[PDB]
Design a protein that fits this description.
part of a larger assembly; 9 chains; A alpha/beta (339); B mainly alpha (38); C little secondary structure (95); D mainly beta (145); E alpha+beta (83); F alpha+beta (178); G alpha+beta (198); H alpha/beta (157); I alpha+beta (381); F: 178 residues; 3-stranded antiparallel beta sheet; two-stranded antiparallel sheet; 6 helices; 35% helix; G: 198 residues; alpha+beta; binds cardiolipin; binds Ubiquinone-9; binds 1,2-diacyl-SN-glycero-3-phosphocholine; binds 1,2-Distearoyl-sn-glycerophosphoethanolamine; electron transport; Respiratory complex
């Protein structure tokens, strides 16, 4: 262990040495931020070239962030990453099944091997992240596969926390940017005209802070928290609201999903990071599940942050010079649906 | 003409010190002793 | 250097100056390295006699400022003699 | 004093002594100032340390090698202005300009002797006495230093 | 490992620093290298170790080799001399 | 002694010849052509640049460059932890903590020069009595990561061993001067 | 030992008396250092009057303001010691007029007497906190736009209380209380032995 | 040779060569290290020879050389200029004032390093880091740019 | 309100301007972007370990800057440097004014748009730094001029090499002389721009080439001769009218006059010691500290503690290439200073930009900053 000395800011010590395999991610970026702010020792396994992880260097202090070359297929790389970590956090995930990695791999196969080694190593705790409402029978292969994982990893690593976040709201997120980027599309398809798929977003930071707090709290063991949010929404208001802040016309036109799953298949064929995914589509119209579960935010210590509050920052880049100065007050809020 | 104030010059509000280090910091006024070495 | 005469002549002319006489690049004119070993001179105060420091320590023989007009007919006096006008140069007065 | 030297002749050297396990006597440093022989007789009643010989090889060390074992022993360190005999535990751990000096109280014994704890970068390096006329007048025990 | 037995414990995490990198240490350790040099058998009670090279060495000091049992060691070089 | 620059001593009254000469100066840009001649002239001069990797700009013995800790010929590191190199460092760069080695000798357990803090003044070179810390000739030690720039005793001692031959030659050349 | 000419220590001394006589309402002390430098000391109210006499007097023309500074002696009731160093290109001599100002007792501004002071007075406010009445535009010059505290005051920590880093979460530079990775080692340097009577 | 792997190794080698050969740098110009580079731009150690642009606006700059102390009043700007540079972009921190605080580390107005403000690729050491020393640092950036394998990572991703 | 600020200007100047069309009606320069705390750090540092700071205030005239601190500290210690050292400081002081002027004239042109003058002279500048490096070991930021005397003797080949540089340097000034002194384009860009009247220059505390350019005859090198400036002969290049041209022409003349002073220094440099022989003020020689006890004690105390200069305060001004550089050093009896106000020729000059750049275009302001030779290290300190 490492006795925590310091005042609490950078150049201080908190005693959390933590491997974080998928740090380069949108959620990840945030996880390393708090861990680094707190003063924790963060080992970031990376596969993308060094150029892309530079954004993580200034976070954390000198000799507090260590980057290791790692390959998912190669078991040895995971082995050495967790050699000297006592906390392992797994954020490995993707939306597009890539040529050389299947949803199973990114969600269930890999995240197993990882926790498996972590145990061999003797890491005190492992935090595994799987998408919210993930039935072993859910339509989207992604969600189901993720469900498959949360089970397995429990056998490789017992009492391994399993936070299960909803789609995340944050700058650089998809949930909010995706819809806002429908601008290019003249019309914005919305299955069931964006109805009956009530959704509860959660700010990225809230999720991050929550995750971090897990690392430094004994109360969470085998817990399957669910960071959800401060307000639910029918996809209709969300879509329009977005377009509202973006100040771009909103033209909700219903599109039969059966045909739309096909549109997802189309972009899905794209070689360079398909923008929409068959598995995405389903997910988007996959209704958010209700909140009866080990609570996440608040329960883990952070009060959720309403979407409207920070939406202005996430959607600003999509506006035009004409609306750039416009502020949240000028715009209207969307409506929640306790349903 | 001069004005009258019985208020102990407190200028804590102008010095520009963070609140924590003005209310939790005790300073000792002492004449330094001599290291016995010299 | 090492320039064919014609280039030099063009150079000198286009520039309007005998640039060859004063080339910027240095060639075997610069002090050779490993110049001989130096035996530097020891200054005063190294005498072994009549060298008492008390007689050579201006550091603290200095005294506290002299005080005039402390709070605790006569002719006018200037800060100092009025300055003397500078004189135009003689090698090159103008330009 | 002066800025230079005129002693072009050779120097002297005096064999060191293992006076004890607390005081390191690198006595080639000694300026034969006899404050040790006094303290060791007047403040403490040891009456062991003494001058031996005459001339420029008067060495102020125990004639036979008998350790200076007494409480009040470590004070010799503080009282020898030269660094001939100094403390063996605090041999070379620090150098005084660096040491931050905090004035505190002796808790090892009930005389409550005043002392100064010299700390560098956050670990105590030395505890030496600070003067209290009534309680410890410039001296501290072998235990509390 | 290092000159001073600086070896991160089997559980310390600064060992992560050495992961995929060389922990810089020097094979040539002084404690040993001085030992190799033999004791100089001078024939005068007090000899001086200028440090070798005069001005290019260490401050000049005189050592008393009078103690028959032990050998004088320059506080600077560590070189030892015996009478 | 003063000198007027740009002060016209007197009013030369225009003479046709003078006027023509001037008018020609404005009309046919005569002085502008003068300037072009100067640059054409250098175009013909040998360029002063050096192939940087193949040729190196000359540095004489006192060049301060990169810190190194020297060792005696025998193999005993020169530093005896007097710690005044720490005292005179202007930037607070050198951190030294010491304890008596098993041999009984004085030596530094930790000697850390923070090169990013160091401003390469060269006073440490000056201050050392045994001259254990020296300003080594190498100036090329640019590093990918900030941590590499912080240097402990082992890097400096290793730096000392690598460059000892040239450091010895450099100190040999300049010690009479000091 | 430096060469000292007493011609100056006499000339300057006399001038000191001359100034004092001409401006007795404000001159408190007038001394000449052993370094041949005069240093009329004036009551803070005499800032405008004493300077103006020196800027515009035939027998003492002190046209340019070399510098305006404020030493801070915390012990002194009037903390700051505003010092104005002036030069006389006509008589090739410099004089220093120094006043005393406490933290909340402002000094007059001399931007009128010398416009050079427009900037230095802003510099003294930013670093030490003395305020100058009738200043055209007094506002921080050297410190950051949001800086809190006057830095050159002897009671201000060197490292200060705030430092800046870029935070990704908020994608913007952000102050945080200073956390230093090697505190300034505070070597004690004063020797316990004095040098001379001085 | 014939393998989709070989074609993707050779083509980045091409992409890396282009970025390596033409690094248009942008010098903020803080403190004095800017002079020790104005000497690199100058004739004894030309930088253009290597494919380095003496003066480049942020939007057309590949490399930012931070020379000089980054005070707490210029920090908010450096980040802006770094943020407004085109994506392929690299930072070289010159001077003990910039890579670490150097003299002025403990000042209340100096950021202790530009690494706190902008991610730094090569740290060039020295109070006035010599001009060859900067040239070695720029050449070290070119060695780092040669090693990068962006196309290979996309192929096996 | 256009907030100009890399600003084409020297250093970093956020010149908050107000563009009445292209004509600029007001400038509010926001300096402070390079304030390092140089004068609050010096209070915590001994007199020798604060010398280095003075090489970084104006970073283009290093040694002349460290001749102002060296003269101050020396005054407060009533000690004077040995004769050879004073000539060496005057030799290095004029190499620095040639170095600053090559900086000021060529970078001004870089701003206006002439690019070649910078390259030709900058090669002549590395020739010069070499002289710094060969005498101190640092190309710039030497630390050679010490509070008492200078640090080490000149290497045995430097004065021959300084002659060879000075012998051929004047042709190099002559060459930019032809390329940038009569070009109608330069004259038009520089002549009648930023005229400053004589009394206004004294009132704004300009004190430099800006003072001399408008015809006021003031050089601290002849008026108040510091070091040996009483035994060297030179002509101050007083300009007549004050336009940015007359100020350029003055800067080109001072480079020429400095070659006249450098010539005299090489011709008449005395045999002797380079640092005062009081071990109390200047460190003891390497051989002496390693053989004599009085010298080791003096070396140990001087490096670890300090000179302990006697209590007092002094304002010492020397003619730095930019203008009058002065240090007001207040000293308690302690080895570390109490206050060190660096008067920067430049804090006064930048204040004048608003008055000098009156009724002028956006382009004129680029020339106005260029003709003040402002380096923000000195202004920001
Ligand atoms: C074109 C026709 C030739 C031009 C020519 O020969 O110029 C050099 C030749 C000598 O000029 P220089 O400035 O005295 O040359 C420097 C040294 O003297 C001579 O320089 P050096 O001592 O280094 O001599 C060796 C040099 C000798 O090289 C040459 O002098 C011939 C260069 C031919 C370039 C074509 O060869 C090399 O160093 C390798 C480079 C060879 C030429 C590289 C460029 C070839 C370009 C081919 C496509 C165009 O020019 C003249 O004879 C007068 C030209 C007047 C023009 C008006
Ligand atoms: C914005 O300010 C700037 C300038 O002014 C606009 C510059 O000029 C400069 C200075 C120098 C440059 C821009 C040089 C630029 C050079 C180029 C754009 C060369 C371009 C060459 C090509 C496109 C060749 C194309 C060839 C083919 C189509 C081959 C086909 C088979 C910079 C860096 C700058 O930032
Ligand atoms: C072979 C390369 C030759 C390069 C020539 C120019 C560079 C060398 C200049 C040397 C020098 O300093 O002397 C300048 C000299 C220097 O003179 P000055 O400016 O010192 O003063 C002389 C003139 N008075 C005294 C009357 C003021 O300039 C001139 O002699 C006048 C040049 C007039 C140029 C008029 C414009 C150019 C010509 C336009 C018409 C077309 C001509 C042909 C164009 C091309 C056709 C193929
Ligand atoms: C029958 C009688 C015929 C008389 C003919 C007289 C010459 C014809 C051209 C005259 C052009 C007009 C002129 O006199 O010069 C204008 C301008 C100089 O004007 P200036 O001196 O500033 O005076 C301003 C007064 N208000 O000129 C300039 O400043 C030009 C700006 C500089 C641009 C570069 C100049 C140098 C160019 C060198 C190469 C020229 C090559 C010309 C030929 C190329 C091949 C065709
Ligand atoms: N809206 C959301 O973001 C939500 C996310 N989650 C879960 O949170 C986790 C983090 O999400 P997010 O950050 O958006 O995901 P990202 O798409 O940002 O990727 C996360 C990280 O996983 C790494 N990664 C992906 N595939 C592989 C692979 N085959 N081998 C090695 N590394 C890989 C990536 O590294 P690289 O880019 O270098 O390949 C990346 O750094 C995910 O696992 C997801 O299941 C759950 C609910 C909502
Ligand atoms: S006190 Fe120290 S110095 Fe004086 S005699 Fe005893 S030992 Fe020698
Ligand atoms: S000065 Fe030389 S010897 Fe003394 S500690 Fe510093 S380095 Fe080691
Ligand atoms: S590093 Fe040395 S040189 Fe570069 S800026 Fe800071 S001080 Fe000036
Ligand atoms: Zn020895």
């Amino acid at each position: 262990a490492v006795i925590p000395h310091g005042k609490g800011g950078r150049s201080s010590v908190s005693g959390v040495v933590a491997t974080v395999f998928g740090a380069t991610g949108f959620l990840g970026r945030y996880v390393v931020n708090h861990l680094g702010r707190m003063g924790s020792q963060v080992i970031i396994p990376y596969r993308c070239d060094v150029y892309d992880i530079m954004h993580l260097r200034l976070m954390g202090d000198l000799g507090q962030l260590t980057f290791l070359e790692w390959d998912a297929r190669d078991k040895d790389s995971i082995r050495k990453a967790v050699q000297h970590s006592n906390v392992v956090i797994n954020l490995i995930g993707r939306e597009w099944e890539t040529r050389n990695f299947d949803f199973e791999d990114v969600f269930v196969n890999i995240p197993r091997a990882i926790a498996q080694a972590s145990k061999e190593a003797g890491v005190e705790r492992f935090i595994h992240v799987s998408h919210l409402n993930a039935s072993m029978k859910s339509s989207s292969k992604s969600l189901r596969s993720k469900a498959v994982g949360e089970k397995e990893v429990r056998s490789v690593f017992p009492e391994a926390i399993i936070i299960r976040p909803s789609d995340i709201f944050g700058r650089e997120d998809r949930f909010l940017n995706h819809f806002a980027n429908y601008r290019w599309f003249l019309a914005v398809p919305l299955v069931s005209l964006g109805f009956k798929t009530v959704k509860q977003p959660v700010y990225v930071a809230d999720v991050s802070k929550g995750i971090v707090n897990a690392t430094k709290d004994p109360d969470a063991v085998g817990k399957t928290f669910a960071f959800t949010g401060p307000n639910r929404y029918l996809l209709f208001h969300l879509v329009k609201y977005i377009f509202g802040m973006t100040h771009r016309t909103f033209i909700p036109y219903p599109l039969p999903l059966f045909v739309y799953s096909w549109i997802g298949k189309l972009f899905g064929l794209s070689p360079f990071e398909p923008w929409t995914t068959k598995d995405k589509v389903e997910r988007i119209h996959i209704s958010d599940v209700m909140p009866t579960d080990l609570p996440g935010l608040e329960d883990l210590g952070v009060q959720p942050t309403p979407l409207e509050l920070k939406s202005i920052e996430v959607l600003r880049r999509h506006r035009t010079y004409r609306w750039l100065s416009s502020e949240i007050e000028e715009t209207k809020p969307a409506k929640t649906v306790n349903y | 003409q001069l004005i009258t104030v019985d208020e102990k010059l407190d200028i804590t509000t102008l010095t520009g010190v963070p609140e924590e280090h003005i209310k939790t910091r005790k300073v000792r006024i002492f004449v330094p002793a001599r290291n016995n070495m010299q | 250097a090492s320039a064919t005469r014609v280039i030099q002549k063009l150079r000198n002319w286009a520039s309007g100056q005998d640039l060859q006489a004063k080339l910027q690049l240095r060639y075997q004119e610069i002090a050779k390295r490993t110049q001989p070993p130096p035996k530097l001179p020891v200054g005063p105060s190294h005498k072994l006699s009549n060298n008492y420091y008390c007689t050579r320590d201006g550091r603290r023989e200095v005294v506290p400022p002299s005080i005039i007009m402390s709070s605790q007919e006569k002719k006018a006096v200037t800060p100092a003699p009025p300055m003397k006008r500078w004189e135009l140069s003689k090698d090159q007065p103008y330009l | 004093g002066s800025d230079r030297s005129r002693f072009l002749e050779g120097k002297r050297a005096v064999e060191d002594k293992n006076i004890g396990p607390l005081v390191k006597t690198i006595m080639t440093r000694c300026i034969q100032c006899t404050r040790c022989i006094r303290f060791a007789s007047e403040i403490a009643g040891v009456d062991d340390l003494g001058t031996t010989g005459r001339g420029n090889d008067m060495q102020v060390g125990t004639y036979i090698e008998k350790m200076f074992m007494s409480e009040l022993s470590g004070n010799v360190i503080d009282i020898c202005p030269v660094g001939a005999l100094t403390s063996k535990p605090y041999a070379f751990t620090a150098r005084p300009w660096e040491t931050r000096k905090t004035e505190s109280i002796d808790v090892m014994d009930a005389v409550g002797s005043n002392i100064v704890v010299s700390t560098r970068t956050g670990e105590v390096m030395r505890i030496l006495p600070r003067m209290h006329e009534d309680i410890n007048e410039e001296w501290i025990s072998d235990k509390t230093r | 490992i290092t000159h001073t037995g600086q070896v991160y414990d089997e559980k310390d995490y600064r060992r992560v620093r050495f992961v995929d990198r060389q922990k810089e240490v020097n094979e040539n350790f002084a404690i040993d290298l001085i030992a190799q040099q033999p004791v100089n058998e001078v024939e005068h009670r007090i000899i001086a170790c200028d440090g070798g090279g005069g001005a290019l060495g260490h401050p000049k000091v005189y050592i008393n080799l009078d103690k028959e049992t032990k050998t004088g060691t320059c506080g600077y070089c560590g070189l030892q001399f015996k009478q | 002694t003063y000198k007027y620059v740009n002060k016209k001593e007197q009013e030369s009254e225009v003479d046709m010849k003078s006027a023509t000469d001037n008018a020609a100066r404005i009309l046919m840009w005569t002085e502008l052509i003068r300037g072009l001649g100067m640059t054409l002239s250098y175009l013909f001069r040998e360029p002063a640049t050096i192939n940087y990797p193949f040729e190196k700009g000359p540095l004489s013995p006192r060049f301060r460059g990169e810190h190194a800790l020297r060792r005696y010929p025998s193999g005993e590191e020169r530093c005896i932890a007097c710690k005044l190199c720490e005292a005179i460092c202007p930037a607070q760069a050198i951190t030294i903590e010491a304890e008596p080695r098993a041999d009984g000798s004085r030596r530094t357990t930790r000697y850390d020069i923070d090169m990013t803090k160091c401003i390469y003044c060269g006073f440490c070179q000056e201050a050392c009595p045994v001259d254990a810390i020296v300003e080594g000739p190498n100036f090329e030690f640019s590093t990918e990561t900030h941590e590499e720039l912080l240097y402990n005793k082992e890097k400096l001692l290793n730096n000392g061993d690598k460059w000892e031959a040239e450091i010895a030659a450099n100190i040999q050349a300049d010690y009479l001067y000091r | 030992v430096r060469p000292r000419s007493d011609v100056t220590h006499k000339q300057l001394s006399a001038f000191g008396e001359y100034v004092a006589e001409i401006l007795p309402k404000y001159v408190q002390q007038v001394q000449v250092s052993c370094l041949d430098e005069l240093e009329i000391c004036i009551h803070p109210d005499g800032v405008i009057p004493t300077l103006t006499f020196l800027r515009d007097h035939t027998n003492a023309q002190f046209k340019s303001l070399a510098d305006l500074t404020a030493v801070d002696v915390p012990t002194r009731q009037n903390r700051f010691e505003i010092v104005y160093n002036l030069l006389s290109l006509r008589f090739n001599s410099r004089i220093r007029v120094k006043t005393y100002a406490d933290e909340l007792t402002p000094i007059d501004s001399i931007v009128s007497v010398h416009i050079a002071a427009n900037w230095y007075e802003r510099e003294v406010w930013d670093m030490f906190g003395v305020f100058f009445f009738n200043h055209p535009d007094l506002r921080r010059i050297l410190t950051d736009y949001g800086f809190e505290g006057h830095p050159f005051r002897k009671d201000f920590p060197l490292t200060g209380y705030v430092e800046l880093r870029y935070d990704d979460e908020v994608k913007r530079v952000v102050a945080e209380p200073v956390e230093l990775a090697q505190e300034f080692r505070k070597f004690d340097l004063n020797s316990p032995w004095e040098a001379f009577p001085a | 040779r014939s393998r989709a792997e070989y074609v993707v190794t050779k083509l980045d080698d091409l992409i890396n060569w282009a970025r390596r050969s033409s690094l248009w740098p942008m010098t903020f110009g803080l403190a004095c290290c800017a002079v020790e580079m104005m000497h690199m731009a100058a004739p004894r150690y030309d930088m253009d020879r290597f494919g380095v642009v003496f003066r480049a606006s942020p939007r057309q700059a590949d490399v930012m050389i931070v020379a000089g102390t980054l005070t707490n009043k210029m920090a908010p700007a450096l980040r802006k200029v770094y943020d407004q540079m085109p994506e392929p972009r690299y930072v070289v921190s010159m001077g003990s004032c910039a890579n670490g605080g150097g003299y002025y580390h403990y000042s209340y107005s100096v950021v202790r390093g530009c690494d706190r403000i902008v991610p730094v690729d090569i740290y060039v050491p020295g109070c006035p880091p010599t001009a060859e020393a900067l040239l070695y640092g720029i050449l070290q950036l070119q060695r780092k740019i040669k090693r990068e394998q962006k196309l290979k990572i996309w192929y096996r991703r | 309100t256009l907030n100009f600020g890399h600003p084409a200007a020297h250093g970093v100047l956020r010149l908050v301007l107000e563009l009445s069309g292209e004509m600029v009606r007001k400038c509010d320069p926001h300096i402070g972007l390079l304030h390092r705390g140089t004068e609050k750090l010096i209070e915590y540092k001994t007199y020798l370990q604060a010398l280095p700071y003075f090489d970084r205030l104006d970073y283009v005239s290093m040694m002349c800057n460290e001749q102002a601190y060296s003269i101050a500290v020396e005054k407060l210690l009533n000690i004077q440097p040995p004769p050879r050292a004073q000539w060496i400081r005057v030799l290095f002081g004029e190499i620095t004014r040639i170095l600053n002027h090559i900086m000021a004239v060529t970078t001004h042109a870089l701003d206006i748009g002439a690019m070649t003058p910078f390259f030709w002279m900058f090669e002549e500048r590395e020739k010069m730094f070499e002289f710094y490096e060969r005498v101190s070991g640092a190309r710039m930021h030497a630390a050679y001029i010490r509070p008492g005397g200078v640090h080490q003797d000149l290497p045995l080949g430097l004065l021959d090499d300084i002659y060879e540089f000075s012998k051929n340097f004047s042709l190099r000034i002559d060459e930019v002389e032809e390329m940038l002194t009569n070009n109608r384009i330069w004259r038009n860009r520089t002549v009648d721009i930023g005229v400053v009247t004589a009394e206004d220059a004294l009132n704004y505390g300009f004190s430099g080439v800006m003072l001399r350019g408008s015809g006021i005859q003031w050089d601290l090198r002849k008026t108040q001769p510091y070091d040996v400036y009483d035994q060297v002969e030179f002509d101050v290049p007083i300009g007549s009218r004050g336009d940015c041209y007359d100020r350029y022409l003055c800067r080109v003349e001072e480079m020429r006059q400095s070659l006249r002073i450098i010539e005299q220094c090489l011709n008449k440099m005395p045999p002797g010691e380079i640092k005062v022989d009081d071990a109390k003020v200047s460190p003891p020689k390497r051989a002496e500290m390693k053989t004599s006890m009085e010298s080791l004690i003096h070396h140990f105390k001087l490096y670890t503690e300090g000179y302990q200069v006697p209590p007092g305060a002094t304002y010492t001004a020397i003619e730095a290439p930019k203008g009058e550089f002065g240090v007001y050093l207040v000293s308690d009896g302690s080895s570390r200073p109490y206050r060190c106000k660096i008067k920067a020729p430049g804090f006064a000059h930048l204040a004048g930009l608003d008055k000098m750049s009156k009724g002028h275009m956006l382009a004129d302001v680029v020339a106005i900053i260029g003709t003040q030779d402002i380096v923000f290290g000195e202004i920001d300190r």
